[PDB]
């Protein structure tokens, strides 16, 4: 592990409180993505010229042309990556990427297959995943690992800072954090096990009456999952709770009733993280004539990571998050 002296920050955009992106460069010249940094995954991609105009959602976003790259290197080797929302799939390809003025040869999938549901609804053309080479689909060395193979990072880690206004959008430090964007001191829990961005929960608080995840729960702390989520039966027990009624995807409660739902916090390596409904309800309205979402989904992540909780934007939005690579934690600060 060399440590050099820079640190460098992605600009990050905030679409609708739901999806934070920033913009990379993929090959010479530079073809601009904008891309979501997802803890959550190791890979990276963003959708390829090769993608058949019959995925419409290739017809309405930036897609990546090797021919008029002359970093390009072929590999080719068949990709899928299947998230828990949706299907992308295609081939990997090399070339020189730059992000926060960094320019590292990064391995990359160029997808030539992506759904128009739910990718349609994307503001963000590809993914750039923050996540272990242990998760990486494809033994695909990350693109966070490769920097770090240039030694020129100050401190083996990076931080995400997700602003409210939906001003800057949201800030990514590569090789330390903002103490802009935090105020107090930083609590560390430690990594389950190298590999994830997963910590031990000790336990979840709704108001003052309900208790969920009494004998403990995983948490995953999710960059890229715009809600907090956890398994259908907790989110099933919690909503009770909170007087919410469960639609298709998500959970409402009637607009007037949303500024009174109790606080909800998580306990995490020792210290109150608390939630108000200011928190994660999208207070649009104060009429009991609408209905108010909820920032926190069900969601069953499968074994052997799930099931677990997911800490997304909802939860990383209050405080600001460093993800320690050097010593397999993650550090927790309010933000401002
Ligand atoms: C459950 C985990 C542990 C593994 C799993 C897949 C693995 C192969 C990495 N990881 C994930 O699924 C990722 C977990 N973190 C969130 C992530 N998002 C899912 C999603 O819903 N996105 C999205 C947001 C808004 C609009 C449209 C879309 Cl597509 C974008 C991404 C892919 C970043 C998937
Ligand atoms: C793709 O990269 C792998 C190494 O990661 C290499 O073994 C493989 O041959 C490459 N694909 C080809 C055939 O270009």
Same mark, same amino acid.
């Given at each position: ?29 530079? %073809? *601009?993505?904008?891309? @979501? ?6 890979? =990276? +991609?963003?959708?390829?010229?090769? !993608? ?69 609804? &994307? /503001?963000?053309?590809? =993914? @750039? ?5 242990? %998760?990486?689909?494809?033994? @695909? *060395?990350?693109?966070? #690992?490769?920097?770090?193979?240039? $030694?020129?990072?100050?401190? #083996? ?22 103490? %802009?964007?935090? /105020? $107090? ?11 994830? +961005?997963?910590? %031990?929960?000790?336990?979840?608080? @709704? ?5 969920? !995840? /009494? ?25 009770? &709770? ?33 939630? *108000? ?14 209905? !108010?979402?909820? &920032? ?12 677990? +909780?997911?800490?997304?934007? *909802? ?15 993650? $550090? ?5």
């Amino acid at each position: 592990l060399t440590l050099g002296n820079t640190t460098s920050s992605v600009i990050l955009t905030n679409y609708m409180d739901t999806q934070y992106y920033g913009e990379i460069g993929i090959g010479t010249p530079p %073809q *601009t993505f904008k891309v @979501v940094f997802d803890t959550g995954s190791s890979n =990276v +991609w963003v959708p390829s010229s090769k !993608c058949s105009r019959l995925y419409t959602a290739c017809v309405y976003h930036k897609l990546f042309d090797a021919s008029d790259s002359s970093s390009y290197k072929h590999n080719g080797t068949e990709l899928t990556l299947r998230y828990s929302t949706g299907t992308v799939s295609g081939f990997l390809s090399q070339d020189i990427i730059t992000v926060g003025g960094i320019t590292v040869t990064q391995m990359f999938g160029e997808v030539t297959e992506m759904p128009a549901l739910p990718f349609m609804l &994307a /503001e963000f053309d590809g =993914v @750039v995943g923050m996540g272990f080479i242990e %998760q990486a689909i494809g033994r @695909v *060395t990350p693109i966070f #690992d490769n920097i770090i193979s240039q $030694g020129v990072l100050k401190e #083996d880690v990076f931080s995400f800072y997700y602003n409210r206004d939906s001003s800057l959008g949201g800030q990514i430090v590569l090789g330390g954090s903002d103490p %802009q964007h935090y /105020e $107090g001191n930083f609590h560390y829990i430690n990594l389950i096990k190298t590999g994830v +961005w997963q910590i %031990q929960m000790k336990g979840v608080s @709704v108001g003052s009456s309900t208790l969920l !995840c /009494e004998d403990g729960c995983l948490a995953l702390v999710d960059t890229g999952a715009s809600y907090i989520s956890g398994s259908t039966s907790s989110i099933e027990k919690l909503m009770e &709770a909170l007087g919410a009624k469960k639609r298709l995807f998500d959970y409402v409660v009637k607009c007037n009733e949303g500024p009174t739902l109790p606080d909800i916090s998580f306990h995490l390596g020792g210290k109150e993280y608390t939630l *108000t409904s200011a928190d994660y309800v999208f207070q649009e309205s104060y009429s009991s004539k609408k209905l !108010c979402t909820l &920032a926190i989904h069900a969601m069953d992540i499968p074994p052997p990571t799930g099931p677990t +909780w997911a800490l997304g934007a *909802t939860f990383i939005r209050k405080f600001y998050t460093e993800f320690d690579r050097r010593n397999n934690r993650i $550090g927790f600060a309010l933000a401002r």
